[PDB]
């Protein structure tokens with residue numbers, strides 16, 4: 001009933017906010033719609049898999065907040081398998097390689113690929129992480145889709161196809177669905193192209209032993225009966241001295257402040273009194289989440305390793321249901337498994353099939369890519385289509401269609417009277433991921449602490465010490481990578497020598 | 500409590516559905532979130548204006564359903580003033596003209612303008628009204644914004660600027676915000692470029708005497724206590740024999756079927772049990788409404804008429820708060836007024852100002868465009884910013900960003916168990932307008948009648964006889980309009 005702060009949403013962000021406030025001595029309540037905490041993280045446990053992350057899973061260097069929170073809760077990480085060769089499957093053929101990027105041999109295609117990634121990061125440097133709408137060319141970039149940008153930048157189909165796969169994989173959306181400004185911000189605020197795409201030294205380096213769901217679960221353990229499950233919030237009334245928060249199951253909660261720790265668009269599920277300001281009212285109708293099915297196929301052994309394949313496959317082409325896989329085998333070497341994502345339009349298209357039909361398609365794909373009949377012999381299968389989730393809206397995160405980030409972006413984490421906004425979408429570093437969830441939850445909590453006069457203004461945003469367990473190697477480039485011309489750059493160079 | 504059909508939303512679509520079901524002998528309840536009916540229509544009454552439409556207002560030829568429904572309810576229309584000259588204000592100068600289209604005199608510009616409008620309609624002919632995702636090039640066109648299309652098609656800045664204004668005015672959204680497929684469908688399903696843009700013989704020909712709000716009000720009068728105001732729906736449960744509909748004010752309604760007559764995205768405000776199917780679950784997060792402030796400045800006299808101006812202004816350029824106006828003077832010739840729309844990003848930008856500040860900006864603009872100091876002497880002002888409305892989400896209607904219509908469009912009016920979908924967004928003719936609201940409400944009602952075995956399948960969709968009061972003249976083109984080359988066409992010929 002009565003408390004200091006109501007946190008709407010018991011995902012990592014809401015739980016991190018609640019924990020910080022609780023630790024500070026405030027009385028907090030977490031109102032969670034589902035019969036579980038964790039939200040876009042979910043760790044299934046059964047005898048066949050032991051445990052498996054069906055939602056958010058990967059953590060890595062530079063994600064120091066999630067690493068610190070998890071460590072404090074008694075969790076450990078392990079390294080995703082990248083010992084053996086990666087595979088790039090292009091035009092029906094597999095090409096093994098090493099390093100974050102698939103190598104390209106054609107001199108022209110090489111220049112084009114090199115220029116694409118370089119330009120993505122170049123453009124990124126012009127975009128403030130905490131205010132992407134302040135980029136010098138914000139409007140120009142926001143008024144273009146990523147498809148238009150790729151069409152302009154890529155002088156080869158090879159680069160365009162790989163860039164497209166990259167976008168689909170990064171933000172579970174099609175290149176024509178998303179703003180170029182927003183996508184460029186998204187990559188930059190994850191530390192750039194190399195950091196976001198890498199397993200070793202990147203966002204996919206590690207997973208939590210026992211699953212990421214433990215983060216939210218262990219915070220719930222700490223908070224006890226303060227977490228209220230199956231309490232979807234339907235109504236927030238700020239017309240009186242204390243904020244009134246009502247749930248679907250007919251309960252009323254009274255608080256000094258509220259943290260909204262749900263995906264921005266899911267704010268639509270709440271009726272507000274007084275109405276939201278115009279900009280937020282419209283913003284929450286303009287910000288969809290992406291589409292993805294996370295699929296894990298289990299095998300007797302990690303047979304790919306015997307062929308000097310680590311389990312990573314970058315698979316291009318419309319026919320492939322999954323465009324990207326990672327080895328999901330336990331650190332102990334058992335429960336051998338391949339994790340694959342079915343992305344964007346394919347999540348929509350293939351949702352029509354049965355679980356068994358999807359398993360068959362994945363195994364047949366993997367058999368071809370790995371050149372291994374063993375891939376046709378799965379022992380178990382688990383999957384989760386996040387598009388079906390009423391209380392998520394999709395995964396991994398919210399994307400911005402053209403024109404929206406510049407017009408409505410500044411509204412995202414602007415308080416509405418006594419409502420403050422958490423959720424990974426409001427983060428400024430690794431927004432979209434578990435790291436961003438922690439950053440945003442703790443920042444929102446500290447905004448309330450400041451509002452109560454408990455901390456100074458300069459303590460709202462707090463730096464995080466680097467993990468000792470997961471140190472970050474710097475992202476480096478070669479002289480040639482920095483200075484090799486683009487394709488049009490080479491053509492202009494030829495033109496001047498001709499003239 | 501218990502009834503045959505619960506209609507969620509008491510706008511024109513919900514009211515039209517409820518009326519049809521009521522007339523058929525079913526027990527209906529309308530659950531309306533606001534303290535009023537009408538939704539995206541709202542007629543304000545006061546001494547200063549008598550009445551004024553602050554939402555949907557215009558009707559015209561080919562909109563036979565809204566005209567028939569209004570007539571039955573005892574309403575009449577009158578013609579929007581288009582006797583005198585229209586004005587196109589370009590690069591700081593006013594150019595008076597007659598006919599629906601502002602003329603162009605540069606020959607290359609003429610070819611470009613002609614080709615643009617022609618191509619819009621050409622493309623439209625390949626788009627099925629009831630299934631735009633079935634267009635032969637549906638994916639190609641859906642994966643482009645209108646901005647990209649205009650960039651490809653328009654070889655002149657003049658054409659591109661006017662095309663942009665057209666998009667902004669049509670769908671209260673920026674060219675880069677919207678799918679080309681969806682926009683081309685939108686225009687085509689309103690009868691094409693000429694029909695949608697025209698006052699005389701088009702969508703802006705007429706208004707209702709006394710206001711369009713009377714449509715929803717008079718149906719509420721007919722239905723009596725069946726309409727429940729300040730009942731926002733929060734929860735729909737379909738797990739049991741009868742559908743359970745719960746409201747915010749703690750009431751429970753039980754019905755055999757439900758009609759959702761709210762903007763698609765506002766379905767998000769309802770918690771569903773069981774959850775919605777995947778495609779609808781995501782669809783309702785992908786479909787925003789546009790942004791507009793409707794502004795009416797009142798004057799002592801319709802002074803523009805004295806200068807042989809009808810009051811229609813098409814105003815190019817970023818600086819102008821309002822890109823389009825119409826004379827809003829009463830049929831009697833009193834309550835002289837100019838109606839203007841503040842569109843898309845300008846609605847966002849100018850919302851920051853006070854009502855008085857917007858009035859000043861509009862009056863100064865009108866003084867410039869009309870070349871009249873009389874425009875600086877308003878006697879009254881009314882405005883409505885639809886972006887602020889929790890239970891609308893915007894106006895005039897829902898737009899589809901690139902990629903959405905092809906991926907999710909088929910979901911729009913697909914029933915979910917015992918929930919059927921009305922609302923202007925689900926119409927196949929004049930979707931977005933009051934006409935579409937009536938079409939969709941009556942179709943949704945008839946889907947339920949068919950589900951109950953009361954009517955055959957072929958009666959779900961019903962043709963509408965042409966209004967005798969507002970007959971439609973055909974849209975015609977000249978030989979030269981049809982056959983003159985585009986700019987690249989002329990270049991290839993050279």
Ligand SMILES: *[C]C1=C([C])[C]=C2C(=[C]1)N([C][C]([O])[C]([O])[C]([O])[C]OP([O])(=O)OP([O])(=O)O[C][C]1O[C](N3[C]=NC4=C3N=[C]N=C4[N])[C]([O])[C]1[O])C1=NC(=O)[N]C(=O)C1=N2C#C[C][N][C]1[C][C]C2=C1[C]=[C][C]=[C]2
Pocket residue numbers: 008009010011012013014031032033034036037038039040041054055056057058059169170171196197198204231232233234261262263266269270292293294324386391392394395396397422423424425432433434435437
């Ligand atoms: C789903 C997913 C997947 C499948 C995957 C992934 C993910 C996801 N991610 C993301 C994560 O998960 C996120 O971010 C997080 O989790 C978030 O958090 P937050 O913010 O907290 O949120 P949430 O969870 O959602 O929560 C919320 C809550 O609330 C609630 N509600 C609602 N509504 C309501 C409520 N309550 C009350 N009332 C009302 N009304 C709900 O229920 C919930 O609970 C991720 N992340 C990370 O970190 N990691 C990972 O891994 C992930 N994932 C993914 C990834 C991928 N990656 C890839 C690979 C390769 C590559 C890539 C990318 C790029 C490049 C390369």
Ligand SMILES: *[C]C1=C([C])[C]=C2C(=[C]1)N([C][C]([O])[C]([O])[C]([O])[C]OP([O])(=O)OP([O])(=O)O[C][C]1O[C](N3[C]=NC4=C3N=[C]N=C4[N])[C]([O])[C]1[O])C1=NC(=O)[N]C(=O)C1=N2C#C[C][N][C]1[C][C]C2=C1[C]=[C][C]=[C]2
Pocket residue numbers: 507508509510511512513530531532533535536537538539540553554555556557558668669670695696697703730731732733760761762765768769791792793823885890891893894895896921922923924931932933934935936
């Ligand atoms: C806003 C607006 C404006 C400003 C303008 C306009 C408009 C609008 N429009 C549109 C109309 O209005 C519409 O369409 C209608 O109205 C719709 O209907 P419906 O479908 O029925 O829907 P609504 O109204 O929205 O209703 C709904 C209801 O529901 C409710 N809710 C919500 N949620 C809920 C509820 N309930 C319970 N629960 C829950 N949860 C609400 O409240 C409501 O009530 C229009 N239209 C027509 O027809 N006309 C006109 O005029 C209009 N407007 C406009 C126009 C413009 N035009 C222009 C000029 C020149 C040109 C143009 C265009 C193109 C070319 C040229």
